[PDB]
């Protein structure tokens, strides 16, 4: 089992699954060996009734599309396809949360409120809403008024775009016509431009996908705003990680999917409730994250985690899940019929994402305090259900010390140095005792042992010194093997940055150091990784492309990850991804996404399966940039 | 070549292009076979990188996906997929009007106006847009923010919906939660809720997509409206179709594509130029069509159409084509490298539409006249390179009477019964004389010989006195063979028909009959037998899944033929599909589409690609409906 995850807990369950003859991802994947390599390359399309059409790699005929599209053209649509599924995925959670502000604001859902208004003045004074002289919830909804008039043109481009990069960084995207018109604008261009018989150039559809994944920059850089608002920006907080965050004496509640609109209501009325857990036999409601919506809720109250993506089936496996409460993205669809034989309650909430054989119940901001009683009394049952049951939990947690949003990492700082506080990070990156910065961000993906793509190439980078800030899954897979739990500082992390993570705890009152990695959020949070890299640009007199920071979607597999890492590039970042994304078809299409981009946005993928080989190439990236600058390294 | 096509000049120049050895899109079908099952059946996921994912149709695993997708799962995203694309397309054609007019009546496009005000007052009045009193720029600019308003989330549902369909038809929408909330906005949620781990339940998936459909059927109506307002109504008009309209004299340029803010643009400036061509040693410019942007100079001007859709490479294969102008969709992109063979300099013109090998001229609406003499100035250049170069145009060619719009064919009508125009035709569905409606729509697909379908089809349910309309290539077939001329009545028509074609041609002064079949334009103007089928239901007073009307996607190809069905079949019409959708792999789905939907919104499919036993199918549905009713069938 250890082929399959690098997560004890994990491979505890996968062994209890296979005794029980209960079918896991791994057993799904086996299954579909081997997988079609005509979709593996990028090579198929089924854009129109005349296909399926493929290509053969190498050899004879097929070489070309039915209608004359080339391998090029195939590949190209394919991706931009992928990329503005990924950005709808986040022009969905950010409506979500702008909506729900709005309803806040106009008396509609009580519930929900203004929690920071620091971060809403700052969000109106850098779109340009005045607040001087105005109310909180007028501020707030024109806030809100202006996110949604981001999805659509306007005489303004979209400006969760233009307001939170560089000036010269929207110079040079405007120049090359990257930046978006609207958010849903885009991606129904994406839609339309890659449908049959309409763009056909390599290069003009990767434009397009450049373009069209700065809309989905936009969807996660207005909901984590809108999120902060809602609430409240993070700070540093210290929780647990793994499966042995689970109580077999509690009710136990997975909130699982993506949105703090449903997780959050979820934390604050299960401690409500706990009198009445307690009257069913429990000692409480032990509410506990999976994916980006555990994220949220670790980052801002302490939740502890118990799992991430890939290895999602396996904390039902424990018979200790009383109920798993689901809103979108990520969810493995598997989770409905393994709950028939775990027990657990798999509750939907959300309209457009419902699952077959799952309990539905419509959560409407409007009422989220009734409709979380709802759910949790199902959760209540059900671990009434199984009194006296066995359960198997592994006893097996890490320590994690989170909540580092760019707020926090800038406060933190500023303790070194109070009206410079990005000084002290720029003067360990000039003398060497940061190396460079390295965001791991996106998923795990069946195809490499779970883990082991992160833990290996953020070990080599430690090791040099660099700077290593994570999100979502990426987040997971780094928390649940210790990364950050500052007692591993010692092991981890090379001289130089131990001295600075020291440094910095020591001045923040810690009597130790800031653990080895950085977390940052949720995925919609990669977006406080470009504030911060931003704010560092804006500082030094540079673009993006000028300076040392690197990203690695090192296990990547949700089209939204793919959108990520391609705004990454469009930004100015070299981005690593760790699994083959489907371009390997067309050469000419790899070398624009890994060379001749840098002469566009400066920015370029790293496609690299081997992890040690990832870790060597991301050094040299940043390495590059380095001497770059006239710096060592 | 007669397995190829019926069309004897495309067999021709299928000759043609054998003895050259130039590859066309039969050849690639060829090359291409046997086509993938897997992507055939629908049973293909590629929406993460853990994929490519398979269903084996029959037999042992795979049986689901990776992720725990199903069957039932896998195929109902796929379509929504393709609606949405087909939906986007129909985005783009309709916003790019909205911008032309808007642009027109604010003074920065003087070569673009109001040429049809009595439409742009009945839109306004539609929409309730007040005109007693405003200068038509300003009921103008307010119809196209009101066009714009429709793509996004807004405090009214899409108007191009709720104010075109009767109240109860409406009603019955809304009651199962399928009126579209912004056009843009459905087809990012589609992208979202077909997204890895999203919504996973098939009713819920194909609810959403009879809601994007509907998001299709309003850029659809949105389209045909502007280009109305902008390039006036259709009234009917007589022309010619076929490869023999081409002029080896004259300097030939194809319009090919879809939207009329360049092909009309294209025929008026054309004319001016006929004594700079006449210089140049040729008869004059002789602007011919293919696909809908000849559909709409064809409707508006008499524009003869060369050829559509599946043979669209042939027009080249004569050596006459010097030039062809593109804009997008349905382009095959086979025509760029065909070019070299042949001579035609293809010409683009969109930014979100170009192909390898071709010359791109932006064209701008602010500077429409001057892109148009730049693109026919390399068109006249062409013509002069073939000076003493043999061609070979086969001589063949239709009549074609056209230009029945809604308003058209209400006026035809009116001839009869001036103040209640519908009746006649209402008359003469309860004697009998006409059996009932279809509309043949859609695209040729290369799996089917070349209008085999449209016209076996065509020639039974004349036979049984059906009414017959035809929009895009469903028209371009049945004019190509001599289904728009009214010499062909009495080969064709049944005797019924045939008295109710000639009363209405005599009272219309025509001293002969309507043609066999009406050609109400575009597949945008697929939108203007909705109003002519939305306004027999309001007469009668009774829903349109009560009228004995049907739809059929006989040859159907590109993603937006499959969004129109599905729209078809949401407002409540039996929908004949002659090629298979990738959704045989789940019965489940095929069920729904089939025959559950019929409880939802009283349409069905027909899938059935026997054309002699889908006509029988369509008469079946026809005289079920005519039973409904009461009446004798
Ligand atoms: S769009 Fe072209 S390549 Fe794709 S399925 Fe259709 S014919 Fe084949
Ligand atoms: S979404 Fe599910 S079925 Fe589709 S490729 Fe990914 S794992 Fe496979
Ligand atoms: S041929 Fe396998 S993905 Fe299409
Ligand atoms: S396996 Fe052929 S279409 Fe995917
Ligand atoms: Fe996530
Ligand atoms: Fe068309």
Redesign the interface.
Known sequence: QNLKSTDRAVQQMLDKAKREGIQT?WD??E??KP??G???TGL?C?????????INPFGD??????????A??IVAR?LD?SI??????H??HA?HLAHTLKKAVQGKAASYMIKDRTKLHSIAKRLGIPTEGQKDEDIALEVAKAA?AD???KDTPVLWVTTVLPPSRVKVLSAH?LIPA????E????????????????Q?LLL?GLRCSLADLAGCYMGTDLADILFGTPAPVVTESNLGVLKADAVNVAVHGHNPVLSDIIVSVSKEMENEARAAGATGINVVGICCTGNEVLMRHGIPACTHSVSQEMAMITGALDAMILD??????????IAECTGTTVITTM??????GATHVNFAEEAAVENAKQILRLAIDTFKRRKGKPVEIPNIKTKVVAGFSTEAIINALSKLNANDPLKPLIDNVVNGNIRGVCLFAGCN???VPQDQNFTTIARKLLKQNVLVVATGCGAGALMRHGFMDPANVDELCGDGLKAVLTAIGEANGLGGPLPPVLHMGSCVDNSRAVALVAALANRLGVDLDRLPVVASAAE???????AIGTWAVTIGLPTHIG????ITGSLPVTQILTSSVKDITGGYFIVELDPETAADKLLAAINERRAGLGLPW
Not at 61 to 70: D, F, L, R, S, Y
Not at 84 to 89: E, F, L, Q
Not at 579 to 582: E, G, I, N, R, S
């Open positions: 991802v799904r994947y299954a579909m997988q079609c005509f979709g593996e198929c089924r854009h129109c009734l005349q296909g399926p059409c493929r005929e097929p070489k070309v599309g039915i209608c004359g599209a080339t090029e053209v394919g396809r503005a599924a990924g950005a709808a995925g022009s969905g409506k949604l999805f659509h043109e016509g609207g958010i849903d604008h991606i129904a261009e994406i839609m339309h431009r890659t449908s049959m018989g309409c763009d056909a150039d390599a003009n397009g979108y993205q990520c969810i493995q669809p598997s989770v409905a019929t309209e457009m994402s419902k699952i077959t993906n069946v195809k990547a597999m949700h089209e939204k990850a793919v699994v083959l994304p489907p």
